[PDB]
Design a binder for this molecule. Structure first.
Ligand SMILES: OC[C@H]1O[C@@](CO)(O[C@H]2O[C@H](CO)[C@@H](O)[C@H](O)[C@H]2O)[C@@H](O)[C@@H]1O
Ligand SMILES: [Zn+2]
Length: 257
């Protein structure tokens, strides 16, 4: 199946998913000088107070924390969005070394990692239906740089040893994703896609300008995961990022002057 290696990585994905060469693919490079401040954009509303985390899992391409999305608990609204989008899961992309790992780039700068908080539009009733709509999903993207530890990330780091290989999962209740957010909600936004197969063009991207810092030890633990299932071994889970795709006929808008 698809992956990030030489024979199954991003340059191969178009064969099974022709939309890989489509008009609104993600990620992209964010050219900070070209992105235009849009005074009509609204503050982003990130309401995560009643989030209910369920599980943590290694899906063979990242690790992911899942949430109960059957009611409006943890929701994203405002900013570029019309309506309400429910948090279903978050996951990460990271590198083999600190100078790569992010999917979006900023003036071609790659960060060590990137956090994606994936939300779907309640007007479509479930995430499967939402991925079939141009405004079905909103993904909040947050850059990670290496420096001080992020305390809110540690609960995640400490259980990664239990989900080393594809297919493994664990209980992961009472996790508060507010602890993964930077101070500022200044953001860039543009219409794009899922960055993993099926690459559906269903995402409004909201990428925060301010990175969070994580420690060397925290990201080191990401790098011990495996793409492979137990017994297939082994493909170390590193460099699970899609590179920047052509911007084509799109404008990136900034929420800040
Ligand atoms: O990040 C995508 C990746 O996560 C999985 C679960 O491991 O799917 C989750 O997220 C999808 C949206 O991106 C949802 O469509 C799906 O319902 C949810 O479980 C993988 O299937 C997917 O490749
Ligand atoms: Zn992602």
């Amino acid at each position: 199946h698809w992956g990030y290696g030489k024979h199954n990585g991003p340059e191969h994905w178009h064969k099974d998913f022709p939309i890989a060469k489509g008009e609104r693919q993600s990620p992209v490079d964010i050219d900070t000088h070209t992105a235009k401040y849009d005074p009509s954009l609204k503050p982003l509303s990130v309401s995560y107070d009643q989030a209910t985390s369920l599980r943590i899992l290694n899906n063979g391409h990242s690790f992911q924390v899942t949430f109960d999305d059957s009611q409006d608990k943890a929701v994203l609204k405002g900013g570029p969005l019309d309506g309400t989008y429910r948090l279903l899961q978050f996951h990460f992309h990271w590198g083999s070394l600190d100078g790569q790992g992010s999917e979006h780039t900023v003036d071609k700068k790659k960060y060590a990692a990137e956090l994606h908080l994936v939300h779907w539009n309640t007007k479509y009733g479930d995430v499967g239906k939402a991925v079939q709509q141009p405004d079905g999903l909103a993904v909040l993207g947050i850059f990670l740089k290496v420096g001080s530890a992020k305390p809110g990330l540690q609960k995640v780091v400490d259980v990664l040893d239990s989900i080393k290989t594809e297919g493994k999962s664990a209980d992961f209740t009472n996790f508060d994703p507010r602890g993964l957010l930077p101070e500022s909600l200044d953001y860039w936004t543009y219409p794009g896609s899922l960055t993993t197969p099926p690459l559906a063009e269903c995402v409004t991207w909201i990428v925060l300008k301010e990175p969070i810092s994580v420690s060397s030890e925290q990201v080191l633990k990401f790098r011990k995961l495996n793409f492979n299932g137990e017994g297939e071994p082994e493909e170390l889970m590193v460099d699970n990022w899609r590179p920047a795709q052509p911007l084509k006929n799109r404008q990136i808008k900034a929420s800040f002057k």
